[PDB]
């Protein structure tokens, strides 16, 4: 798993983590999220309000076009509901829709891992979406509360780490974009945290 990781990731993750100011600066954007989401603590987490028949997303404040970036998402297991998707989006991706869906990854402007189903979405309405990671250690993975999201803008990849192990690149084809941390959620009163881990 780790032999596929971006250059510099092991060193980035071993460094002292960004302080609370940096976590807020790179955290969720109150000015760039669904109307049904509130961003709290200056960006450290968001809460989705209990609005029926809605999927709701948020972007981070800072868009990345070069180098290696990583962040931790913390998403309580019992607050995931039917469609919990973690990834990245351009500034143009839609962040709300009036039904329950994997909104993140349902278009050209977003890329998501469904942490309930283990499926990857890009330009996908869901039918046929591939498993990630591929394999049997892949067929049994339960995504725990915390996961790392790893964006390599030199290779143009998005991948994830759990429990200290990089799980491989999930998506390629990201170069020449400005990409923001993103999630889409459906669960009433879910509280999803973002913890920026820095850049190389």
């Amino acid at each position: 798993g780790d032999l596929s990781c971006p250059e510099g990731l092991e060193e980035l993750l071993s460094a002292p983590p960004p302080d609370l100011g940096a976590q807020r600066r790179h955290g969720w954007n109150p000015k760039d999220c669904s109307e049904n989401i509130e961003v709290k603590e200056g960006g450290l987490y968001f809460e989705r309000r209990p609005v029926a028949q809605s999927t709701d997303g948020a972007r981070g404040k800072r868009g990345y076009s070069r180098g290696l970036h990583a962040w931790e998402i913390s998403w309580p297991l019992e607050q995931r509901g039917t469609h919990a998707v973690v990834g990245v989006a351009t500034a143009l991706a839609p962040l709300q829709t009036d039904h329950y869906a994997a909104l993140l990854g349902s278009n050209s402007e977003s890329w998501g891992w469904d942490i309930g189903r283990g499926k990857l979405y890009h330009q996908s309405k869901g039918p046929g979406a591939p498993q990630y990671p591929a394999g049997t250690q892949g067929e049994q993975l339960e995504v725990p509360e915390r996961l790392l999201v790893v964006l390599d803008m030199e290779e143009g990849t998005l991948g994830y780490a759990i429990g200290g192990t990089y799980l491989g690149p999930a998506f390629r084809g990201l170069k020449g974009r400005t990409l923001y941390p993103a999630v889409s959620a459906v669960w009433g009163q879910c509280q999803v945290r973002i913890r920026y881990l820095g850049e190389r």
Partner: peptide
Amino acid sequence: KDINNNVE
């Protein structure tokens, strides 16, 4: 509340 903990 519905399946996703949202107000009906």
